[PDB]
C-alpha cells in the first residue's frame, strides 16, 4: 500500500553528482592501477606460476 510510496520518497532525496565526474574518476582509477594487471599486460614466463 503506502510502503512503496514511502520507499520512493526515501530514495528520492539523495545527493547526485554529475556523470562526467564519475566517468573521470573511473578513467583515472583505471589508468592509475593499469601497471599491476597480469592479464592485461602479459608477465614474463619466468615469474608465471601456472606455466
Amino acid at each position: 500500500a503506502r510502503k512503496l510510496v514511502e520507499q520512493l520518497k526515501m530514495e528520492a532525496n539523495i545527493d547526485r553528482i554529475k556523470v562526467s565526474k564519475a566517468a573521470a574518476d573511473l578513467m583515472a582509477y583505471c589508468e592509475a592501477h593499469a601497471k599491476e594487471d597480469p592479464l592485461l599486460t602479459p608477465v614474463p614466463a619466468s615469474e608465471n606460476p601456472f606455466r
Binding site: 500500500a1 510510496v5 528520492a12 547526485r16 556523470v19 566517468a23 573511473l26 578513467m27
Partner: peptide, 29 residues
C-alpha cells in the same frame, strides 16, 4: 489515488537522472 500518486515520484526521479546526465562515458573516453 495513491497508485496514481506514486507515478509522480517516478517522473521526478527520471527527470533528475536526465538532468544530471551531462555527458556520456563514450564521449569522455
Amino acid at each position: 489515488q495513491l497508485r496514481q500518486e506514486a507515478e509522480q515520484l517516478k517522473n521526478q526521479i527520471r527527470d533528475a537522472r536526465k538532468a544530471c546526465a551531462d555527458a556520456t562515458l563514450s564521449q569522455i573516453t
